[PDB]
Amino acid sequence: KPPKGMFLSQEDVEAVSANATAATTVLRQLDMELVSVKRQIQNIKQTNSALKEKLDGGIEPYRLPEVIQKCNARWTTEEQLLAVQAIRKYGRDFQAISDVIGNKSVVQVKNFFVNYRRRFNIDEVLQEWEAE
Amino acid sequence: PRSFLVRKR
Amino acid sequence: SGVEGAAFQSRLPHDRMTSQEAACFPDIISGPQQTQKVFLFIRNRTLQLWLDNPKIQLTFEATLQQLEAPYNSDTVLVHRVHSYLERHGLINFGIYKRIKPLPTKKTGKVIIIGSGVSGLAAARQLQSFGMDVTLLEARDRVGGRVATFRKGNYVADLGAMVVTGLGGNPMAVVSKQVNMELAKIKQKCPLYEANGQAVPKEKDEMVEQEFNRLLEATSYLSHQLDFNVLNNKPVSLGQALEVVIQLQEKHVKDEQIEHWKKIVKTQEELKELLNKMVNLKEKIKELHQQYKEASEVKPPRDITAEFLVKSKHRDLTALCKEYDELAETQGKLEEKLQELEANPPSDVYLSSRDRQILDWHFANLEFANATPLSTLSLKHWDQDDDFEFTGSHLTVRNGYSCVPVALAEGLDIKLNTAVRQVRYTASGCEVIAVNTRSTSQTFIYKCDAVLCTLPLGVLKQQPPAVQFVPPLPEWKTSAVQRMGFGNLNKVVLCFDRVFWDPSVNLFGHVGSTTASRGELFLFWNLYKAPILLALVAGEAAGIMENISDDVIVGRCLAILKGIFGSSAVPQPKETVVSRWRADPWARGSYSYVAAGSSGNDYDLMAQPITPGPSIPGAPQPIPRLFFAGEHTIRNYPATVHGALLSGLREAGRIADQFLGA
Ligand SMILES: Cc1cc2nc3c(=O)[nH]c(=O)nc-3n(C[C@H](O)[C@H](O)[C@H](O)COP(=O)(O)OP(=O)(O)OC[C@H]3O[C@@H](n4cnc5c(N)ncnc54)[C@H](O)[C@@H]3O)c2cc1C
């Protein structure tokens, strides 16, 4: 039932009444708590200012142009050899392997494993990737 | 008493 | 309605019988609903008749004539109702033309101490009931704490000034009987700070709203949280206000903390992200070099050398995506962080100027209760709130003295007669008084009954101005100690011309410090002549009584000069300064409900004293010593209407005792 814009809890009343200078004690500890949080802002925003300095330039110098290469259904001997090495470096990450080759969808790369399992000992290649 | 207050609202 | 409105104007519920009525009409209230409604209509109608023409006595015969059947059926019921109303002063009270002249043969003898409104009200009632009445008054005038200053056309009340609304006010009846010039007070009242600058309208409204919220809070603190005792001592209203303000400061700080604490949490998220982005930029830089070196190997190349270019390319676009996702996340945390900096919580609960203006509203409250807020009972300070009258507050342009002077006509009043000792026994009373002018001249008044209207200030005086023999019982003296008697002074400034706004009745002055919030904090313009009246309230009243009139008129002119400019404010022709605490026939202004007191002490003050038997084993005597005055009326304390009503009450209680009901 307290009036709007007034805040009066049993706990707060008891904490101001408890002592003869409890009120003034409670108000200074919030003042010191506030000065303490305001200096911890200055510290982190000055730390954050330094990290922004180090990121000046972004990654625009190290950015590589986009590849506009059109996915092809036919597997060249090159593409097969790229794939086996992609299976060796990356695991079952079908997405990365497609990106490396550059003209094989995740669907196409999915099938490669079953067709060539026998011929490119892909089980052995995965075991070699797991051991590292 | 309360009633003596000026501009009581 | 007209019958329903008469009950309201008589402070009675129109549709129900009161406790007082139940006592005098037990047969009726204990019986059938129809008889009660008949009783209530007879009562309500009799009142209506009196109220419509209060300048002439309403007889029983006149009442019966103007009653229609079946209400005029029962002639004894009508006679009992009329008699009850007359006895208790609900009809034929104040100043009216008597139809049947008073019988020469008088029954019983009453001494009334004080010719204030309470005294005069009682005296008239008793005399008109056929008792022998003598008032003893210490002053050279009647009216007591109703005191009107008069020099030529200048007229200004140093005592009671305001009729607190006519709706249910018995001074409504008196105003028809006496020629009082009642003039409505305009609620509008601007403030003016230490320098003389009007408080800007928007700010004034903000502080006032805050004052009312702070009061409402103390009430919440009192009734809901039951914060009425602290360290085995009653909680003051002042204490509660301090505590409520502190909790409002405590919230402002808590609010700031929570806001800055969520800023550092955001800054720490950003810090943890920037570190991730800095480490990723280095890994992107290193990986770009590796890719550059791999592509520097010109074709034709084996498939492992081709794979190295392709794998490093794939790896670099992946890490460049991560950094772009993190850079988006960084950009939205920088928006959030800039928005928190834009919308901070309030710096302070109340400014230094706000606290000074709030102190004026506390001064206003210290004026109304005529005491520092540190003395008022938190729980009960406002205990009489439910009985406040309806309608606009009015001033008496005539001067309020016109009322007591009128009431004093045809009454045996000994002025300059200071009661020193009140003696009361099974066989009667002696009142021992002296001449105020020569203390040696001693007077002895022998009476059946004494009505004490001595102010609470006097009853409190230690060592006593008035000795009671035998001494008042512990229950009476404890009530006198417990109850608060306040102080409030007026400075009357009479000029040759109006240098102020005639359409504004009141205007405040804000003091520099809390310690002086009451000092000339309010100015009244209610009179025809050019008169300004300055109130001294709170702690200031007590202290300002030691300071001389010149210095006080000094501080007054200074404050007025600051608001209207040095050229506009002349020297006043006539100045008057009240000192009510120093006045030995008041010892203060009026009662307040002190911390540790309640409404119940007002009822204790009203209770009459019954002497012991002269010879032991003699039957229980009758009451001899009765009490009236504003400190005796729980529902209308510290008022003229309260005094008036307390007199009428004791006249009825005394008549009932000594003439029989
Ligand atoms: C500054 C001020 C402003 C006020 N403003 C208002 C207001 O605006 N509206 C309102 O309704 N009320 C107001 N009041 C209150 C009002 O004045 C009183 O409540 C009322 O007049 C009290 O009447 P009373 O009969 O109870 O006491 P009093 O009027 O004091 O009557 C008691 C009498 O006893 C006499 N006496 C004292 N000692 C002795 C003795 N030893 N022997 C013989 N006689 C003695 C006194 O001289 C006095 O005449 C105000 C009071 C003051 C002081």
Side-chain angles (χ1 to χ4, degrees), chain B residues 4, chain C residues 113-120 136-139 141-147 158-164 367 400 417-420 433 453-455 458 465-466 488-490 578 580 583-586 588-590 628-631 637-644 646:
Chain B
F4 279 10
Chain C
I113 305 179
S115 67
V117 169
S118 66
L120 294 165
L136 311 187
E137 174 52 56
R139 296 176 196 274
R141 57 172 188 85
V142 303
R145 294 203 283 298
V146 166
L158 299 163
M161 195 165 61
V162 178
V163 182
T164 72
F367 139 66
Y400 218 150
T417 316
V419 170
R420 285 271 197 77
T453 85
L454 291 171
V458 170
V466 173
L488 169 66
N489 285 310
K490 304 191 167 191
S578 87
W580 282 112
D583 181 359
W585 319 127
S589 59
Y590 46 86
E630 61 85 3
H631 56 281
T639 55
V640 170
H641 52 91
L644 202 288
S646 79

Side-chain angles (χ1 to χ4, degrees), chain C residues 37-51:
Chain C
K37 289 178 189 177
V38 168
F39 165 81
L40 288 174
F41 183 88
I42 293 166
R43 175 249 270 168
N44 291 334
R45 183 54 182 152
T46 317
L47 287 166
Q48 183 173 29
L49 293 175
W50 158 249
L51 287 175

Side-chain angles (χ1 to χ4, degrees), chain C residues 163-185:
Chain C
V163 182
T164 72
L166 297 177
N169 190 331
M171 299 305 293
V173 164
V174 172
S175 52
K176 285 286 152 79
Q177 292 174 342
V178 185
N179 198 70
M180 316 163 72
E181 283 182 358
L182 293 192
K184 292 184 176 188
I185 302 170

Side-chain angles (χ1 to χ4, degrees), chain C residues 162 174 256 360 448 465 614:
Chain C
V162 178
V174 172
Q256 283 177 14
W360 180 97
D448 298 290
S614 289

Side-chain angles (χ1 to χ4, degrees), chain C residues 77 200 239 257 272 295 329 355 362 402 421 452 505 512 535 594:
Chain C
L77 182 52
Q239 286 180 29
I257 284 180
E272 171 165 317
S295 49
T329 299
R355 188 64 180 78
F362 291 143
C402 69
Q421 184 171 117
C452 184
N505 281 133
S512 304
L535 297 192

